[PDB]
Each structure stands twice: as C-alpha cells, then as structure tokens.
Design a protein around this ligand. Structure first.
Ligand SMILES: *[C@@H]1O[C@H](CO)[C@@H](O)[C@H](O)[C@H]1NC(C)=O
Ligand SMILES: *[C@@H]1O[C@H](CO)[C@@H](O)[C@H](O)[C@H]1NC(C)=O
Length: 170
C-alpha cells in the first residue's frame, strides 16, 4: 500500500525527492489528556536554528533531500518545554516521494508508518510515557496547511493530510 498525496499544480516526475527530516510544533498537550499533539510546521524551515540539516530545495513541513543522521532518528529543540519553539526532526533513513506527474506524489505506507514509530519513540524519550498524536497543521492560510516545495522554478503544494493523522503509544 501507498499514501497518495494530491498536489497543485501536477508535480513533474523529476520533483521526486527523499524526505530526510521535518519540523514539528507541539501545541502541545496544554491542560492534560496525558497526550502530546504534534503538527507539521508551516513556517520557514530556516527560521529554526539548531536544525542545520537542509540541503538545497526550498520546502515546508519536511526536508526534501538534505542531511541524514549517523544512523538513529535525532530530534532536537532549543527548548522542548516552550511550545513556541519548533522541534527539529532528522531521520536516519529517507522515505522517498515519487511524483508521477498525474497530480499526486506517492509514499510507501510501510516506510512512513515505521518512520513515525521511530519519531514517536524519540518524542517519548523527551516527554515520557504519554500518547503521541500526529495531526494536521491547524491553519493560517491555504499556505501553511500544506507541504509546499520548489522544483524547476515553481511551487507545488501537496495535501499532506494523511502523513499526520495517527496516534502512537496511546
Ligand atoms: C533517495 O534515497 C537514497 C538515499 O541514500 C539515494 O541513494 C537515492 O539516489 C535517492 N533518490 C531520490 C530520487 O531522491
Ligand atoms: C533531490 O535529489 C534528487 C537526486 O539528486 C534530484 O534528482 C531531485 O530533483 C531533488 N529533489 C528536488 C525537489 O529538487
């Protein structure tokens, strides 16, 4: 099985990338459900220091191409206790996005799931034994809410509401 994310306009095949990390923002679990909600960020991915892992392509939410870890998912922040501070996520293996040109870029469901199992068990190291909920960016504009990227001089905007709709370790 495969996660089919629609994008506008129809991304060319050469815009296939590797996901090598992502910026998350805890809202975070503010007055108790024994949970933590995390959402992908809509902010500039260079407006977050101590996450100097981006290569060349301009994006939001995830890092297309760019730097990987030595061989364990590494999650960092300037202060996890402050929810205004974004969380840097750097992978160890990259999940490939295959843009076929029709209108959607595709992700192996199995690859994502286990990239999510590792992130959540890393977040669970920092914050402890609590439910890690992955959810959609909660707005701002039609830009913010999507995974946007630059490829061939143009911006493509992908409905990323599928990658972030999970709960781990209830
Ligand atoms: C993505 O994944 C691996 C990372 O080592 C790389 O060897 C491969 O060439 C990359 N392919 C694409 C399409 O990004
Ligand atoms: C990322 O790297 C691959 C392999 O070099 C490249 O072909 C692809 O176009 C890059 N992705 C983007 C969005 O430019």
């Amino acid at each position: 099985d495969t996660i089919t994310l629609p994008c506008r306009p129809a991304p060319p095949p050469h815009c296939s990338s590797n996901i090598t990390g992502l910026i998350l923002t805890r809202d975070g679990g503010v007055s108790n459900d024994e949970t933590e909600i995390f959402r992908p960020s809509g902010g500039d991915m260079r407006d977050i220091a101590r996450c100097q892992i981006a290569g060349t392509v301009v994006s939001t939410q995830l890092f297309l191409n760019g730097s990987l870890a030595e061989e364990e998912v590494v999650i960092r922040s300037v202060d996890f206790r402050d929810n205004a501070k974004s969380i840097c996520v750097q992978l160890d293996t990259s999940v490939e996005i295959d843009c076929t040109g029709a209108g959607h870029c595709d992700i192996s469901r199995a690859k994502w799931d286990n990239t999510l199992k590792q992130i959540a068990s890393k977040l669970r190291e920092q914050f402890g034994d609590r439910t890690i909920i992955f959810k959609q960016s909660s707005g701002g504009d039609p830009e913010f809410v999507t995974h946007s990227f630059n490829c061939g001089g143009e911006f493509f905007y992908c409905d990323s509401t599928q990658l972030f709709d999970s709960t781990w370790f209830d």
